[PDB]
């Protein structure tokens, strides 16, 4: 089955004294400047972005097309390649998981409709306008609302051509046990704290977070960059590092049965027929991390560790006699309650720096390993 997988990626290191070395392409050995860790896959400095992306994201996108949910974390110290893995630089050798994922999603879906047909509604739902109403909304929206960049050409199969679809993104930040919508229409010049809660389907969501409709990989990246502008607003109004907070970018594939007897591509009007699947990409705060800020980060990452360990034991246990996931011990873990209770697919990418300076911090990062062996 599709249990949680943890993979590890070494960043480039031009030194003679490494704190860890890759062995089996699925194993890593500790090196004092005494433990061996086993992962589902180990990437070396030679493994480029394209290799990571296919091994890390293609099966999650295939999940998305199947109407199932997926969750991907990047974990590690600052300067570990965590942001490089996730986003990188918009070049052929530099682009990370997120833009390639957006590219492949938009390459692989069919029957993508125009905007304002689907639209977000109360309590984490979507409704459906009639076409002429949506048409004016588009021209109402267009009153509101230069990338030379590498683009992934990969097209995956598996989209349900009996479904019509639209793509919505939410971009959310968890900083100091408070949750913020980086896509909020901020009026006061301050981001509003947001509540993490469930809907009637028991699915977690951010109450007042904005679901932004995007028609292309390009448009989705424009929205992502807008969120990055908000993400850089520190408490002291300086530049806040991505290591200081958790960033949650959720790609939603909103689907509905295609309507017959029309020359257009349009859903059936019954909104209860809507199916929504998620691919959620999370760029965790740096594991090395303003005192309450660092305590929230270590509390949340420690809760995450405990939760995936409970998740692993539950995946081997029976229907009864399975143990509670302590997901309420942090805001971050609460937001992914469904995944940590075994719904959907979770993949964690442990980014580690082989430099001997990051030795002790790699010991905590490699503790996420599926299993461990001692010298």
Residue numbers in the entry: 25 to 57, 70 to 181, 188 to 331, 341 to 426
Published text:
Kinesins are a large family of molecular motor proteins that utilize the energy from ATP hydrolysis to move along microtubules and transport various cellular cargoes. Zen4, MKLP1 (human homologue) and Pavarotti (Drosophila homologue) are kinesin-6 family proteins. They walk to and accumulate at the plus-end of interdigitated microtubules, playing a key role in formation of antiparallel central spindles during cytokinesis in animal cells. The kinesin-6 family proteins have two characteristic features: a long NL and a large insertion in the motor domain.
We crystallized the motor domain of Zen4 (1–441). The final structure was refined to 2.6 Å, with Rwork/Rfree=21%/24%. Interestingly, Zen4 is in the nucleotide-free, apo state. The structure reveals an ion, rather than a nucleotide, is bound by the P-loop (L4 loop). First, the ATPase catalytic site of Zen4 is in an open conformation, with the Switch I region (L9) moving away from the P-loop. Second, the N terminus of Switch II helix (α4) extends two helical turns and moves outward, consistent with enhanced microtubule binding in the apo state. Third, the nucleotide-binding pocket of Zen4 is occluded. In contrast, α6 of Zen4 is partially melted and ends at Phe419 (corresponding to Phe318 in kinesin-1), which is almost one helical turn shorter than the previous structure. The NIS, starting from Glu421, flips backward, forms a five-residue β-strand and becomes disordered after Ile426. The backward flipping of NIS mainly occurs through backbone hydrogen-bond interactions with the N-terminal β1c strand, becoming a part of the N-terminal antiparallel appending β-sheet.
